[PDB]
Ligand binder design. Sequence first.
Ligand SMILES: Nc1nc2c(ncn2[C@@H]2O[C@H](COP(=O)(O)OP(=O)(O)O)[C@@H](O)[C@H]2O)c(=O)[nH]1
Ligand SMILES: [Mg+2]
Length: 157
Amino acid sequence: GMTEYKLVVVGAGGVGKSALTIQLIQNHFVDEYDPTIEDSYRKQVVIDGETCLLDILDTAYMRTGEGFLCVFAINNTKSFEDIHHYREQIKRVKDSEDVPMVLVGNKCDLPSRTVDTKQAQDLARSYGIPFIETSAKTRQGVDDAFYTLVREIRKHK
Ligand SMILES: Nc1nc2c(ncn2[C@@H]2O[C@H](COP(=O)(O)OP(=O)(O)O)[C@@H](O)[C@H]2O)c(=O)[nH]1
Ligand SMILES: [Mg+2]
């Protein structure tokens, strides 16, 4: 059969969890999206030549997660400061120190960057995970983030 990957998008309010998901799925940038709406979105894609099904859960099911995107916004220091909370949450619900994960720095199209690449890279390295810069507005890195996570899930086992 065709492979299915259950992915989960986590992070502080306003970082672009919904916008990133809707970019991946509907291929357009949502300028506003109810912050309390939590829902799952499905899409068939090809990644590195392999066809598969994605099941993205956009948080505002959690235990069934095979891979997690931890999102902060590069113009939102508070959202970056909060990442550890989500990291630790995931390790608790999965009851494991080994969970496929990607750190995502979103809104890289904006000029008022307060979290530099160095900081993000160092944080990611301390977790042993990749760091991907993204923009839900421009589509920069959007595929890369979600695909990298699938490659991490494939690399997981
Ligand atoms: N400029 C810019 N704005 C973004 C980006 N991603 C999300 N936003 C905006 O940030 C706000 C909150 O985004 P949203 O997806 O609802 O964040 P969420 O609470 O994490 O789900 C909205 O006004 C979005 O249009 C981005 O990459 N660039
Ligand atoms: Mg949202």
